[PDB]
Design a protein around this ligand. Structure first.
Ligand code: HEM
Ligand code: HEM
Ligand code: HEM
Ligand code: HEM
Ligand code: MN
Ligand code: MN
Ligand code: MN
Ligand code: MN
Ligand code: MN
Ligand code: MN
Ligand code: MN
Ligand code: MN
Ligand code: MN
Ligand code: MN
Ligand code: MN
Ligand code: MN
Ligand code: MN
Ligand code: MN
Lengths: 158, 158, 158, 158, 158, 158, 158
C-alpha cells in the first residue's frame, strides 16, 4: 500500500539510527566481555538484539508502504576506550535517536499514518528504557566508585 | 457490636499511623528501585504491603465495633534525599507508632477489650520486626561503609 | 531523563486523584463486606487494587522524568451512608478524574511526550471500565428495586 | 449439480430470514449484556451463532445447486426497547420464518429434492427449539413478575 | 457514559463498513471452497471471522457511549465472478474502509475520546494486514500465472 | 416382516446400481494408483468402500422385508482410458443412480414405508456428495490444465 | 595476546565482507517475504543469521589478538529487483568473500597462527555451503521455469 514519501524518509532515517546502535552496542558488549565484565556484556548484548529487532520492524514497514529500505549508509560510531566513556556514547546516541523519533511521530499524525505512529511510540517506549539503564549505571560508578563498580560486573546477574 | 469510644479513637489514630507509613515506604521503595538498588526496593516494598495489611485489620475492627474509620487525615511524610537519611525517617516513624501502640494496648485491657488488645500485640510484634531490620541496615552502612553497602544492594537477595 | 514540568504537574495531580480513589473504594469495600454484601465487597476491593496499580505507574513515571511524586496531599473523600449513595460518589469521582485525564493527554501530545500519553490512555481505558460497572449497577437498583438488588449481593459471583 | 429454480428461490428467501435473525439476536444479546443481564446475553448470543450456522448451510446448498446466494437484501429488524418487548420480536420473527420453512419443505418434496428437504427439516427442528425457549421465558416474566425475573438474569446459569 | 454524537456516527459508519465486509468475504470463501480452492476458502473465511469480531467491538462501544448500533443499513456488495476479480473487490473495499478509519481516528483525538481512538487504531492495524495479504496474492497470480496459482490453492497450507 | 413387492423391486434395482459402481470405482482406483496418481487412487478407493456399504444396507433391508437380494445381474461398466474420461463415467453413473433413488423414495412414501425411504434419503445425501467431488475435479482439470492437475495427484493429501 | 598485524588486517577485511552480507541477505529475505515467497524468506533469513555469527567470531578473535574490530566501513550492497537477479548478487558476493578467505588462510599458516586459520577454514566450509544452495536454486529456475519456481516458494518447506 503506497504511503507518503516523508513518512518513508523518516522511517529510513530512524532505521539508520538503529543500524549504528546495533554496531556500537555489539562492539561494546564484546569489549566488556573481553575485559571479564560478564554483567556488562550480557546487558549490552541484549540491547543490541533489541535494536536488531527495532530495525526489522522498520524494514518491513517501509516495504509495506512501498519504499526501499536504505541499509547502505552507516553513521559515525563513537566507541570510547574506557567503560564510563563507552556508556556515555551509548547514552548520547540514544538521546539523539529519541529526538528523531518524536519528530517522526508528530508528522505521521499530521499525515494520518496512525499505524506507523503506533509502532514508533512502541519503539520509543523501548528507547526510553535503554536510556534509563544507562543513566542508572553511570550514577552507580559515581556513587560506589569505579573499582567497586568494576568488581560488581565480573559475574552476570539473574 | 458497639464498643468503647476511646478504643475506637486509639484504633483510628493507629490506622492513621499506618497510612503515613504505607505512603512513605512505597515512595522510598520506588526511589531505591529508581536508583538501581534492587535489594532495598524489594524490602521497603514488602514492608509497605505489611503496613497495608495492618491498616485493613484496623478498618475492619473499627467497623465491627461500630465506629467509622478515618481515612481522610494524612500525616507528615518525612521523605529524605539519601538512603541513610531515608532509612532513619523510616525508623523514627516506626518508633513513634510503637509508642502509640503500647498506650492503646494498656487501655484496651483496662476496658476489657481483649480481642482488640490481642490484634494490636500481633501488629506490635510486626513493627518491632520492621524496627530490627532498619537498625541492622543502618549499622551495616556504618560498619562496611556506604560504597560497599551500595554495591551490596544492586541485586535482590533470596 | 528530565522532562517537562507541566507534564510532571499533570502526572502528580492525576496521582492525587488516584490516592483519594484507593481510599474511598477500600472503605466502601469493607463497609459492604461488613453489611454482608459479598459481591459488592469483592468488586469494590479489586477496583481499589486497580487504582493502587494506577498510582504505582505514575510514581515510577514521575521518578523517571526526574520529578518528585507528591503523596502528601489527600483529597476530600465523599463516603456516603447507603449503597446507592456510596456507588454514586464512586461514579462522580471517576468522572472527575477522567476529565483531568483528557486534559493531561492532550497536553503531553503538544509537548511530544508520547510515552506519558500512551500510559495515560491505558489508564483512561481502565477508568471508563470502572465507569461502566458503576452505571450498570445504579440502573439495576432502579430496575429490580433495592431489596432484590440487596438479596443479589449476599454471595459473590464467579 | 444444477437444480430447480423455485427451490433455489425458497432457499434464498430462507437465507434472508436467517440474516435478519442473526442481526437482531446479536444486537439484543449485547443490549442485555450491557444492562448486566448475563444469562440473557449468553442465550441470545448462542442463538445468533446457531442462525449463523443455519445461513452457512443455505449458502453452500445454493452454491452446489448452482444458484447465487443473495446476501444483499436485509429485512426489517424490529429491535424493541425493553426485554419483554425484545423477546416478543424474537418470537414473532421465528414464527414467520417457520412458516416459510414449511412452505419450502412441501415444495422440495413435490419437486423431489429430498436432500434440500432433509436439511430444512433439521433447521426447522432447531427453530422450533428457539420458539420453545422464548415462549417459556415470556411466561416466566408473567409468572414471577419482572423484578424477580430481572434479578434471575444477572449471573449466567450452567 | 454518554459521549459525543459525531463519534457515535463515525462508529456506526465504520460498523456498516464491517457488515458489508463480513458478507462479501463469507460468500467469496464459500465460492472458493465450492471450486475446490481449499487454501483460499480457509483464508477468506477467517478474515470474515476477523471482521465479525471487529463489528462486535463497535456494537459494544456504541452501546457504552449510549448510542444505538445501526445493523439495518447494508452496503453494496461487489462480488465478482473470477478469483482475480473477487480478490480485487476485497482489496478496494478494504481500502475504502481504512480511509474512513483515518478520518474517524483524527476526530476522536480532537474530541478527546482516546479510548475510542485506541480501539480504532487496533482495528486499523488489522485492516492493513488484510490489505497486505490481498496485495501479495494478486501479485503472485501476476508472477506465476493463473494456472500455477490455481494449482497452488487446492490443499490448505499450515 | 413381509413388505411390498414394488418396494423390494426398487431396492433390488438400486442394489444393482451399487454393484456396478463398486466395480467401476475399484478398477479406476487401481488404474490411477498404477499410473502413480496416489491422491486419485485414495479417493476413488474410499468411494468404492462407501458403495460397498450402501449395498450391504440394501441386502439387509431386502432380507428383513422378506425378499431375495439379486447379486446375479451386473450392469455395463464404462471404464474409460484417460482420467478425464474415467471421472466423467463415474459422474454419469452417479447421476443415473440418483435418478432411480428419487423415483424409489417417492414411491415408498406412497406405500408408507417410511423406514425404507429414510435409509434411501441417507444414501442419496451420500451420492450427492460423490457427485460434488467429481464435478469439482473435472473443473479443476479445466481450470489449471491437465499437466498441473496430474502433478497435483502424485502424493495423497491429508 | 597480541598477534600479527597482517593477520588482524585480514580478519578485519573478512569481517567487513560479513557485514555487507548480513545486510544484503536480510533485505533480500524481507523482500521475498513481502512478495509472499515464504520458502525464500526462511532460507535467506537464516543465512543472514549465519553471517551474523560469522562476524561475532571475527570480532572476538580480533579482540583477543589485541586489535580493534572495524564496524565503521560498510561495502556496496548490490540489491537487485527480481529474484533471479537477487540470488545472483548473493552468489557473486559469496564468491568474492571465499576468495579473500583463501588468501587469509594461507597467510596465517606462514605466520603460524594456526588457531586463526582453524576458525577461518570452519567459516569457509560454511560459505561453500551458502554457495551450493544458491547455485542449485539458480539452476532450478532454469530447469522448471520461473512460474513453477515461484509457485514452489509460497509455503516454507520443512
Ligand atoms: C541490518 C543489520 C542487522 C539486522 C537487521 C539484524 C537482525 C537480527 C535479528 C532480527 C535477529 C534475530 C532476533 C531474535 O533472535 O529475535 C538477529 C540475531 C542476532 N544478531 Fe543480528 N542483525 C544485524 C546486524 C548484526 C551484527 C553487526 C551482529 C554481529 C556482529 C549481529 C549478531 C547477531 C547475533 C549473534 C544474533 C543471535 C543469534 C542466535 O541467538 O541465534 N547482528 N539479528
Ligand atoms: C488506605 C490505603 C491503602 C490500603 C488499605 C491498601 C491495602 C492494600 C491491601 C490489603 C492490599 C492487598 C494485600 C495483599 O496482597 O495481601 C494491597 C495491595 C497493594 N497495594 Fe495497597 N493499599 C493502600 C494504599 C497503597 C498505595 C499508596 C499504593 C500505591 C502507590 C499501594 C500499592 C499496592 C500494590 C502495588 C499492591 C499489590 C498489587 C498486587 O500484587 O496484586 N497501596 N493494598
Ligand atoms: C452482524 C452480523 C454478524 C455478527 C456481528 C457476527 C458475529 C460473530 C462473532 C463475534 C462470532 C464469534 C467469533 C469467534 O468465534 O470468536 C461469530 C462466529 C461465526 N459467524 Fe458470524 N456474525 C455475523 C454475520 C455472519 C454471517 C453473514 C455468517 C454466515 C453466513 C456468519 C457465520 C459465522 C460462523 C460460521 C461463525 C463460527 C461458528 C463456530 O465456529 O462456532 N456470521 N459471528
Ligand atoms: C470387485 C468387487 C469388490 C472388490 C474388489 C472389493 C474389495 C474390497 C476390499 C479390498 C476391501 C477392503 C479389505 C480390507 O478391509 O482389508 C473391501 C471391504 C469391504 N467390502 Fe468389498 N469389494 C467388492 C465387492 C463387495 C460386495 C458385493 C460387498 C457388499 C455387498 C462388499 C462389502 C464390503 C464391506 C462391508 C467391506 C468392509 C468395510 C469396512 O469394514 O470398512 N464388497 N472390499
Ligand atoms: Mn531501537
Ligand atoms: Mn535503544
Ligand atoms: Mn503496621
Ligand atoms: Mn512497621
Ligand atoms: Mn485509576
Ligand atoms: Mn477508576
Ligand atoms: Mn435458523
Ligand atoms: Mn431461530
Ligand atoms: Mn474489520
Ligand atoms: Mn479487513
Ligand atoms: Mn451408493
Ligand atoms: Mn456414489
Ligand atoms: Mn560468513
Ligand atoms: Mn555466506
Amino acid at each position: 500500500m503506497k504511503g507518503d514519501t516523508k513518512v518513508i524518509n523518516y522511517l529510513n532515517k530512524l532505521l539508520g539510527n538503529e543500524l549504528v546502535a546495533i554496531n556500537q552496542y555489539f562492539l561494546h558488549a564484546r569489549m566488556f566481555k573481553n575485559w571479564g565484565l560478564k554483567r556488562l556484556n550480557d546487558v549490552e548484548y541484549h540491547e543490541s538484539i533489541d535494536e536488531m529487532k527495532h530495525a526489522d520492524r522498520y524494514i518491513e514497514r517501509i516495504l509495506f508502504l512501498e519504499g526501499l529500505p536504505n541499509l547502505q549508509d552507516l553513521g559515525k560510531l563513537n566507541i570510547g576506550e574506557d567503560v564510563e566513556e563507552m556508556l556515555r556514547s551509548d547514552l548520547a546516541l540514544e538521546l539523539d535517536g529519541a529526538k528523531n523519533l518524536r519528530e517522526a511521530i508528530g508528522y505521521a499524525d499530521s499525515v494520518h499514518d496512525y499505524v506507523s505512529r503506533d509502532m514508533m511510540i512502541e519503539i520509543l517506549r523501548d528507547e526510553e528504557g535503554h536510556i534509563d539503564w544507562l543513566e542508572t549505571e553511570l550514577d552507580l560508578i559515581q556513587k560506589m566508585g569505579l573499582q567497586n563498580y568494576l568488581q560488581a560486573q565480573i559475574r552476570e546477574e539473574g
